[PDB]
Amino acid sequence: KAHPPELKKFMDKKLSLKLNGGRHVQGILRGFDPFMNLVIDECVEMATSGQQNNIGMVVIRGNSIIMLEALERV
Amino acid sequence: MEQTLPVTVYEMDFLADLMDNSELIRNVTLCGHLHHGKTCFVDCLIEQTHPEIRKRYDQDLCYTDILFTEQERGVGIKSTPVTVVLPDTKGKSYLFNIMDTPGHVNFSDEVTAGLRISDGVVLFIDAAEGVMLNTERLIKHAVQERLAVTVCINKIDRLILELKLPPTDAYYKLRHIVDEVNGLISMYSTDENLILSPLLGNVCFSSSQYSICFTLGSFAKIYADTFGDINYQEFAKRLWGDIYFNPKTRKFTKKAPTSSSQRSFVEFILEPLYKILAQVVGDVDTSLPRTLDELGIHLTKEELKLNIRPLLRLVCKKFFGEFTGFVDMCVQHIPSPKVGAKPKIEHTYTGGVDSDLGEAMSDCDPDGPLMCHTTKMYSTDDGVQFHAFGRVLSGTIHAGQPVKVLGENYTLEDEEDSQICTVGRLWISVARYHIEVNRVPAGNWVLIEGVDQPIVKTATITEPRGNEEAQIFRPLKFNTTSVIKIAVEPVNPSELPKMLDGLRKVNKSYPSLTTKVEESGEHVILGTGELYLDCVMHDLRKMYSEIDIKVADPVVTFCETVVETSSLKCFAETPNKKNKITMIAEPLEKGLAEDIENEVVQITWNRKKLGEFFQTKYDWDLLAARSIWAFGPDATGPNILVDDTLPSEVDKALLGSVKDSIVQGFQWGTREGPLCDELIRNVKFKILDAVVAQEPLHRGGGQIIPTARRVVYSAFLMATPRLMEPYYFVEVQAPADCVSAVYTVLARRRGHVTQDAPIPGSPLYTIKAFIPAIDSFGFETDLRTHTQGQAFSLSVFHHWQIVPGDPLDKSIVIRPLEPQPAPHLAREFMIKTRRRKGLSEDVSISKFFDDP
Amino acid sequence: GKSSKMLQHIDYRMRCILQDGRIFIGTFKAFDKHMNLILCDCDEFRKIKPKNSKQAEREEKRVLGLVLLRGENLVSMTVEGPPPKD
Amino acid sequence: MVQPINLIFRYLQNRSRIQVWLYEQVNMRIEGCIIGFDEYMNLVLDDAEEIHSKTKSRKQLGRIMLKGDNITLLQSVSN
Amino acid sequence: TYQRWQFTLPMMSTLYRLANQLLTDLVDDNYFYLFDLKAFFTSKALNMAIPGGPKFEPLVRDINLQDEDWNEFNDINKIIIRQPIRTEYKIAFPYLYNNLPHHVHLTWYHTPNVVFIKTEDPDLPAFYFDPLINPISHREPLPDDDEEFELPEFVEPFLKDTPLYTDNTANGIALLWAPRPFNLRSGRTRRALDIPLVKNWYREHCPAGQPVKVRVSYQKLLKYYVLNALKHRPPKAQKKRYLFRSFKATKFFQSTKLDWVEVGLQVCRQGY
Amino acid sequence: IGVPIKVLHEAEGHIVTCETNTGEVYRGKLIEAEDNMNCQMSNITVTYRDGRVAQLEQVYIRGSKIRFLILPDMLKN
RNA sequence: ACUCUGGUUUCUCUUCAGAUCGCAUAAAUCUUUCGCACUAAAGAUUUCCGUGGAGAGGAACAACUCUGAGUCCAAUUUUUUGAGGCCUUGCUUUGGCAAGGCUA
Numbered sequence A: 001k002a003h004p005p006e007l008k009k010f011m012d013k014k015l016s017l018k019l020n021g022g023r024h025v026q027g028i029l030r031g032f033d034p035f036m037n038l039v040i041d042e043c044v045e046m047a048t049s050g051q052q053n054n055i056g057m058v059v060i061r062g063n064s065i066i067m068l069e070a071l072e073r074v
Numbered sequence B: 001m002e003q004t005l006p007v008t009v010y011e012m013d014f015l016a017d018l019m020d021n022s023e024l025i026r027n028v029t030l031c032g033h034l035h036h037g038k039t040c041f042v043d044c045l046i047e048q049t050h051p052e053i054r055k056r057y058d059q060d061l062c063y064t065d066i067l068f069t070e071q072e073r074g075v076g077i078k079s080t081p082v083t084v085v086l087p088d089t090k091g092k093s094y095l096f097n098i099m100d101t102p103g104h105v106n107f108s109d110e111v112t113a114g115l116r117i118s119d120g121v122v123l124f125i126d127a128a129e130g131v132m133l134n135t136e137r138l139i140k141h142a143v144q145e146r147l148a149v150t151v152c153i154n155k156i157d158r159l160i161l162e163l164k165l166p167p168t169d170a171y172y173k174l175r176h177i178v179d180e181v182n183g184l185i186s187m188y189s190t191d192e193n194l195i196l197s198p199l200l201g202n203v204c205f206s207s208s209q210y211s212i213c214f215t216l217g218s219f220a221k222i223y224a225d226t227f228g229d230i231n232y233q234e235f236a237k238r239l240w241g242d243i244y245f246n247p248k249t250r251k252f253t254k255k256a257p258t259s260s261s262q263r264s265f266v267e268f269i270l271e272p273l274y275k276i277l278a279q280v281v282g283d284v285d286t287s288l289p290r291t292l293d294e295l296g297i298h299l300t301k302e303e304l305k306l307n308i309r310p311l312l313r314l315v316c317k318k319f320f321g322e323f324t325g326f327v328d329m330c331v332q333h334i335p336s337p338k339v340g341a342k343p344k345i346e347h348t349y350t351g352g353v354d355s356d357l358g359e360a361m362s363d364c365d366p367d368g369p370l371m372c373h374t375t376k377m378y379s380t381d382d383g384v385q386f387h388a389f390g391r392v393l394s395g396t397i398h399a400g401q402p403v404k405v406l407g408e409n410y411t412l413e414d415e416e417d418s419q420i421c422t423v424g425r426l427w428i429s430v431a432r433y434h435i436e437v438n439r440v441p442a443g444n445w446v447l448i449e450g451v452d453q454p455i456v457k458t459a460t461i462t463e464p465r466g467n468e469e470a471q472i473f474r475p476l477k478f479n480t481t482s483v484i485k486i487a488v489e490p491v492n493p494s495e496l497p498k499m500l501d502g503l504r505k506v507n508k509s510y511p512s513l514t515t516k517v518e519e520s521g522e523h524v525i526l527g528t529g530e531l532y533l534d535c536v537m538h539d540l541r542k543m544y545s546e547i548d549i550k551v552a553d554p555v556v557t558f559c560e561t562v563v564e565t566s567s568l569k570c571f572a573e574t575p576n577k578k579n580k581i582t583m584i585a586e587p588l589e590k591g592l593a594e595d596i597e598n599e600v601v602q603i604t605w606n607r608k609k610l611g612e613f614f615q616t617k618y619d620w621d622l623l624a625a626r627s628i629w630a631f632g633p634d635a636t637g638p639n640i641l642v643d644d645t646l647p648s649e650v651d652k653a654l655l656g657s658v659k660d661s662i663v664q665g666f667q668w669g670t671r672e673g674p675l676c677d678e679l680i681r682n683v684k685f686k687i688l689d690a691v692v693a694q695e696p697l698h699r700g701g702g703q704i705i706p707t708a709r710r711v712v713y714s715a716f717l718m719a720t721p722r723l724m725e726p727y728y729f730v731e732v733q734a735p736a737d738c739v740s741a742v743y744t745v746l747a748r749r750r751g752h753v754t755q756d757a758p759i760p761g762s763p764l765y766t767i768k769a770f771i772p773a774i775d776s777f778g779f780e781t782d783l784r785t786h787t788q789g790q791a792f793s794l795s796v797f798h799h800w801q802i803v804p805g806d807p808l809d810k811s812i813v814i815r816p817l818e819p820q821p822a823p824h825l826a827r828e829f830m831i832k833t834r835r836r837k838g839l840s841e842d843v844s845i846s847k848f849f850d851d852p
Numbered sequence C: 001g002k003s004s005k006m007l008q009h010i011d012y013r014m015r016c017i018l019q020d021g022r023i024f025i026g027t028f029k030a031f032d033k034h035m036n037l038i039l040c041d042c043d044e045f046r047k048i049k050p051k052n053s054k055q056a057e058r059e060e061k062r063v064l065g066l067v068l069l070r071g072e073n074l075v076s077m078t079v080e081g082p083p084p085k086d
Numbered sequence D: 001m002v003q004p005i006n007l008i009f010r011y012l013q014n015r016s017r018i019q020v021w022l023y024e025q026v027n028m029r030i031e032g033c034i035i036g037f038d039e040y041m042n043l044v045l046d047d048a049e050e051i052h053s054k055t056k057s058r059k060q061l062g063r064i065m066l067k068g069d070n071i072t073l074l075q076s077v078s079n
Numbered sequence E: 001t002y003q004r005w006q007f008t009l010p011m012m013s014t015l016y017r018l019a020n021q022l023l024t025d026l027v028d029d030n031y032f033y034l035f036d037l038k039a040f041f042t043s044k045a046l047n048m049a050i051p052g053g054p055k056f057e058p059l060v061r062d063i064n065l066q067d068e069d070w071n072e073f074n075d076i077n078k079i080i081i082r083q084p085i086r087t088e089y090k091i092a093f094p095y096l097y098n099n100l101p102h103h104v105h106l107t108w109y110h111t112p113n114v115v116f117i118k119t120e121d122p123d124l125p126a127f128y129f130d131p132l133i134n135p136i137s138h139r140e141p142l143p144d145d146d147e148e149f150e151l152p153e154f155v156e157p158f159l160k161d162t163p164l165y166t167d168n169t170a171n172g173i174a175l176l177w178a179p180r181p182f183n184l185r186s187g188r189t190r191r192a193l194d195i196p197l198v199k200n201w202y203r204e205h206c207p208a209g210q211p212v213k214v215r216v217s218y219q220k221l222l223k224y225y226v227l228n229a230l231k232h233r234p235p236k237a238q239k240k241r242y243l244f245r246s247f248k249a250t251k252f253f254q255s256t257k258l259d260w261v262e263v264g265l266q267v268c269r270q271g272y
Numbered sequence F: 001i002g003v004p005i006k007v008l009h010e011a012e013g014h015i016v017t018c019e020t021n022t023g024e025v026y027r028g029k030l031i032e033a034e035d036n037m038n039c040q041m042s043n044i045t046v047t048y049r050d051g052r053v054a055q056l057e058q059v060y061i062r063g064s065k066i067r068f069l070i071l072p073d074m075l076k077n
Numbered sequence G: 001a002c003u004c005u006g007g008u009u010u011c012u013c014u015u016c017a018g019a020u021c022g023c024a025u026a027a028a029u030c031u032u033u034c035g036c037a038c039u040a041a042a043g044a045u046u047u048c049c050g051u052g053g054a055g056a057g058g059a060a061c062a063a064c065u066c067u068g069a070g071u072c073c074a075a076u077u078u079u080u081u082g083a084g085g086c087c088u089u090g091c092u093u094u095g096g097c098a099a100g101g102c103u104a
Helices: B012-020 B038-049 B068-073 B108-115 B133-144 B156-163 B167-188 B216-227 B232-236 B264-282 B284-295 B308-320 B324-333 B341-347 B356-363 B493-509 B531-544 B592-597 B607-616 B652-657 B659-672 B704-718 B736-747 B779-786 B825-836 C004-008 D004-014 E009-019 E037-045 E087-092 E169-175 E199-203 E212-230 E243-249 E260-271 F003-010
Strands: A014-019 A023-031 A038-046 A052-060 A065-070 B025-029 B080-087 B093-100 B124-126 B152-154 B244-246 B251-253 B373-379 B386-391 B402-406 B419-422 B445-447 B460-462 B484-490 B515-517 B523-527 B549-551 B570-573 B580-587 B628-630 B639-642 B683-691 B724-735 B752-755 B764-772 B796-802 C012-017 C023-030 C037-045 C061-069 C078-081 D017-022 D025-037 D043-052 D057-066 D071-076 F015-020 F025-033 F039-047 F053-056 F059-061 F066-071
Touching: A023 A052, A023 D071, A038 D004, A052 D004, B012 B080, B012 B093, B025 B108, B025 B324, B038 B080, B038 B093, B068 B531, B080 B324, B093 B324, B108 B133, B108 B373, B133 B167, B156 B167, B156 B264, B167 B264, B216 B232, B216 B264, B216 B308, B216 B324, B244 B264, B264 B284, B264 B308, B264 E169, B284 B308, B284 E009, B341 B356, B373 B460, B373 B493, B386 B493, B484 B493, B484 B531, B493 B515, B493 B523, B493 B531, B523 B531, B531 B549, B570 B704, B580 B704, B628 B659, B639 B659, B652 B659, B659 B683, B659 B704, B683 B704, B724 B736, B736 B752, B736 B764, B736 B779, B779 E087, C023 C061, C023 F003, C037 F003, C061 F003, D004 D025, D004 D071, D025 D057, E009 E169, E037 E087, E037 E212, E199 E212, F003 F025, F003 F066, F025 F059
Parallel strands: B025 B093, B124 B152, B639 B683
Antiparallel strands: A014 A023, A014 A065, A023 A038, A038 A052, A052 D071, A065 F059, B080 B093, B244 B251, B373 B386, B386 B445, B402 B419, B402 B460, B484 B523, B484 B549, B515 B523, B570 B580, B580 B683, B628 B639, B724 B764, B724 B796, B752 B764, C012 C023, C012 C078, C023 C037, C037 C061, C061 F066, D017 D025, D017 D071, D025 D043, D043 D057, F015 F025, F015 F066, F025 F039, F039 F053, F039 F059
16 A cells, blocks of 8 residues: 555656646656655746746645646657 | 346446447457466356356366367367456456467467457466477467567466475476577567566466466555555565565565575465465365465365365465456556557558558547458357357447458459448357347457358458448468368268368368369368368368268378479460560579568568568579569469560560569469479579560460460479478477387388477476478377377478479389388379379470470 | 445435535445445536426536546435336 | 655755745745755744735745645745 | 265375375376277277277178279379378377268367376475476576665565475375375265276276286276276166165064174075 | 445546546546546546636546546446 | 354155266167177167155254354545635525635
């Protein structure tokens, strides 16, 4: 038990993620954890106005994870 | 549907719904050597799927051997495909289009039929006997067939209880088996990704005799159920191999610690199995309850009072539960029909994958044109009607639909072989009790009923009034070639029409069976071996044509062959003297015949690729290799037609106007042969020159082809010819104490023991030989009789060798009942063939020549 | 000790109103400890539950098939009747 | 394979000023230098300040304890 | 009533050890190829003779060789002869090497060889690589240990306490391959006369170098067995009336117990 | 083993839809139906609550924001 | 682990059994078969040699061993809450309903 999420196929691939509060980010998955904490290397968050701000590698928790969409071939 | 089916764990509606899905159907064939355990493994699968059907304590419930010949003879006769829904390791339920092919080397035709209606092959290897001749042949054929492969190891109970090797030695034997399988794979594979290993998840360890199927993932999941909170995938990734486990660090170390830690697999997989099998089979009465409590299984007083073997089977079935590991491995390796649609279309489907119809077929969309394909044609219980069997590459075949069943030669230019029929009342692919259905989605295996009228060997059912630009799926290419011939005639000639109707039916039934009537009126039917033809007769005289038929003595289909070069230039002229062709014969360079016959040198390629492959590999002149005309008798034929006409004397365009006729004549001649009316192999007929008239009325047409055949026969006769006979490789597996008797038996059949070697881990050696097929009739009975029933052997036509003597030798007498000596074989063979075929008893070098 | 409260409504047509406000009426053929329900022949209606509606009884009714209602958004459930033979 | 826990531990050991977004509330987040983290996602942020993107105001609170449920995403910042 | 005989594994092992002299000590039934009941039935039905087996009168009268006159499919001047097809090669493949094989029972193909290394010394362990078994030549992308593949402290093999060998383990594994009464562990007490202790000897191939009288006796015994087997009409459904129990119910009979010698002497006097 | 997790694991290989708590409905082939409600599809059509529909070559929604899932009930009978 | 119809042995009778009724094997009659039938085959029939299934009755000692049955989870991913409030539009069953935009 205590298996991690499906981050092996999406690891090292540029894809988008939806975070809570209406947040949208795009980056490469550098790894995942068992509590849904994933590492987004070279992450860029798209604001509601249209502009995107690059925040670099960040840690995303699994509670506010809405859905991930692979932007490349998996 | 208002049908009737035996009780099953799944639901018939659920099965139909799963079939409607396009990416969850497993099209697999359980290829495996003779008596490896394939049929018993399918029986275990059925027993899990069908609760009512259970195996008897002594006689195994062979639910995949429907035919009586397979029921009593013991060896599997034909493939009984089963389509059943079984769960997986994770829990998702798939459906499997299994096809339990037989293991006999003679019955390789059914295996070849199965692969064209499947996406992957599950090779079966017996643990005790390792790889065998049939196993290696099936591996080579499957890899050449471009299908996924998943080797599984069965009969582990033999190692655990009969052979009694220690667990470390058991792992050593298993690793050697896997290494040999991988090495054999790499000999013919193309992509390096085609690797097999328990670490890669493409290996299963089963025991059909006791239902002990498992794998790394499944058995790690068994630990997970027993312990909990264990990462089954990652842990199983460390459960196999040379790495040893270190209890002190609670981690698996690549370098073996403590100097006494066995491999991970032996430590965790083999040990428990050994312990449980030893407790069940050796100490049941004393320590049966404690071991059962430790393992968790509970058995009632009645269940624990069984015999040792059924009790062991029950305990193993309780311990391992369902065969989840096999399904998981098949899902992992063998792709879905939609995933594998493109490889199938590229390989077997004709007309090209890049074509529009090819693209539609590759899409594998049920809402598309119907382009199904039926490999095998099964027979009804009564033996009157035939039920074609195949898998739908596209569309959805439904009962009562009108279809256009394209035959085995329904080309695009000449659709004359098409027969517009009305398929109807089709069932699902069950083993012992078929289940009806209304439609058949693209991907499932459909047993149509009504399209059997034009379906002789193989056919592709299409959609009438549409798909006008369609092709017929490529005809099957069998592993080995049939060389045995047997004339058959009814005892009472009154019932001849019944016997010939039965012969047509049995020709339809057996894929590789070849039947014909020669100029002598004999009803010759071919066949791979000896037991093959015995089964053919036991079906012909007792199932289809209930009359009694008399079968002559078996023979071997000899083939012509030229040794020396052409004696002189043969000047053959067409009727009315409008054309005068000339051809010079020459034997083909060694290896080129086997390269063409293996489809390596494919004339289908363009001029550049064929020219390069001829100038480089065959060392042919860059100008000589650029004038090839045809490929002898067949598309893949051992003869090469070369346009050796000098341009200074012969116009290229004028020769091209007769090029088609010349190629057709050369093909007909190479199919016929000048010596014994047999196929001519290992020759290179080159047209030295030719005279061609202008008008097509005078030149070509119906005059060039007979002149071409005459010139070909004259060229193949002028050059010193020699008959050839099939030599069948025999791999006798006998105890090392009896290998001397095996060598002694093969001495009296003009055959040399090519290689003797012991089986790694098994006391029985595996002697390999090459006995000519002509004198190989009954060799199995002698080998198993001179050894008091302790040796079994098989056969397969490896190659052809020249007859010891000379065919055109009029100085050698013959005898009616005395076997001709070694030097007097070729002339005797030629004379007896020309007499049996009823042709003229004399074939002189000036028979078909122009001057006589 | 018994646990028959989930088995009494199992296999019968129940109409459950979740926390989102929709009412799913279908054959409750699946259950679990986390409140995950399985509705065979389930119809979801978000306008109003039709119970003797004079103007209309089906408003915004969508058929799903094998609907899987998660237990995280479950609020309450109501039994409508027994299941059919098929 | 860089996990999120190892990256959070490296950001806590580096003492860099990182910004964390509120879970279910993107209008206001926190920013500061976290000295260490806990097992329940609660970190001890030194010189933490609440920055609201709607009003463009920053209110500093000092050494704060950020719970793992209130913070949804955390990114790197230069200041 | 003595209807069930279910003994423990060591008891059956001791019984087999005390009776291994009369047992044929076979493993695979393939050693009786073309010498089984089906083979004998096929030989008798085909008017042929297996050299090691019996021969009976033909089931169907066979016409003479001259009855046919050089038919197109029977011309000797066309058949290529390499080896003479013996009666064994015809009884083995009846459908391919015998014209008109009416009522010819087929025989089972070779079952896989039972490669069971029989024990020879109790001192050696149970699962040991015996010298008879051919040695295995010891010549895997194993993942590195740098990961965190750590197992819980409670994870252990299922039978860590259970040994891989036992005193009765080797003996128990021996009884797997044995004559049928030894193979089973629970049986019904058959009648004394219904247990032939010498049938397996006759059924096997005759011992080498036996005199002509012994070979003829073996052939006659095989003929009697084949006759009793081919005529094995299943028994009919009786009403299950016991003549002995009926006479016991009759008031004109008493019951007692006496030695077989005394009863035999009394029976001899009564017969006189 | 739950009945819903077993139906999600056995629902792989066929077409099904999954609606989240925010109204995002992704319909397609359930490539991965994990026990933690993680639904991974390939070439899934995702329609949001506003009405805009798009296609994703590989989408993966976590089980924390799962509202409902409609799969084919033919495998249940 | 709470309780519960449920003991085996043995004797007798009836009835059914084409299952290798029996991991054994005989006898007799007829029929066809060549003789000129212990030394012979085939087909059938019948009686024994003695079984299994079920039922019924009886006397010995087990009363529930047995088995079948009636009987420790608050901190992500479901059940110990991102929880409550503001405005607009159509109907107001003037309670509020459905949707959209915000503070939390």
